[PDB]
Symmetry: C2
Subunit: 119 residues, 2 copies
């Protein structure tokens, strides 16, 4: 089965125009069978992201208490479904911002397993 | 089974940055199980491309006799594996060009079933 850690890296990491979300949501499999409504890709280094798991502990949006807020801002891209998006033709809006990210962490070593929010 | 017509649409149609090939090749699943060496995406409408089957008859690179060359030049993007590309990390060099395309047609009705070359 796909690890939560590898799932997070597939859904959220892209360390490194207007169709960026369209092509990446497709490439990273968030349009297989349904359109992931919203998804964030983080461009900081995988190391900088994993380090968020040793940063400020916050409560996840769902109440789980294994969320971690990043101490510094991060280049991320917000992928949000356009109003026309309708599986099997998922279409997204691409927005780039610099924000702190909140991720959930799990496993040993503790790594990010869910992208919770961007402050 | 996936029809040759649909495969051609999944593989070569994208009607409508330098990572474009890395992304699209991944998204249209030509990086799945292996990396497809070379691949072209055509940005003209599906009708223009399907119309090619009624255009100029030409021989195919591979000696077959069911190739047709578009009468008009079309906006296309060429994808070619870069030298370090190696499954599962397929990698491509993106090159946008405006050339006449040559596709192989087949089936009933005769539609594009292979992208043969651009000229």
């Amino acid at each position: 089965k796909e690890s939560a850690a590898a799932k997070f890296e597939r859904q959220h990491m892209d360390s490194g125009s207007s169709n960026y979300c369209n092509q990446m949501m497709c490439c990273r499999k968030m349009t297989q069978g349904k359109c992931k409504p919203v998804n964030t890709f983080v461009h900081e280094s995988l190391a900088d992201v994993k380090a968020v798991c040793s940063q400020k502990k916050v409560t996840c949006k769902d109440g789980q208490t294994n969320c971690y807020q990043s101490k510094s801002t991060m280049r991320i891209t917000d992928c949000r479904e356009t109003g026309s998006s309708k599986y099997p033709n998922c279409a997204y809006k691409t927005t780039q911002v610099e924000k702190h990210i909140i991720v959930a962490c799990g496993g040993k070593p503790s790594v990010p397993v869910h992208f919770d929010a961007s402050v």
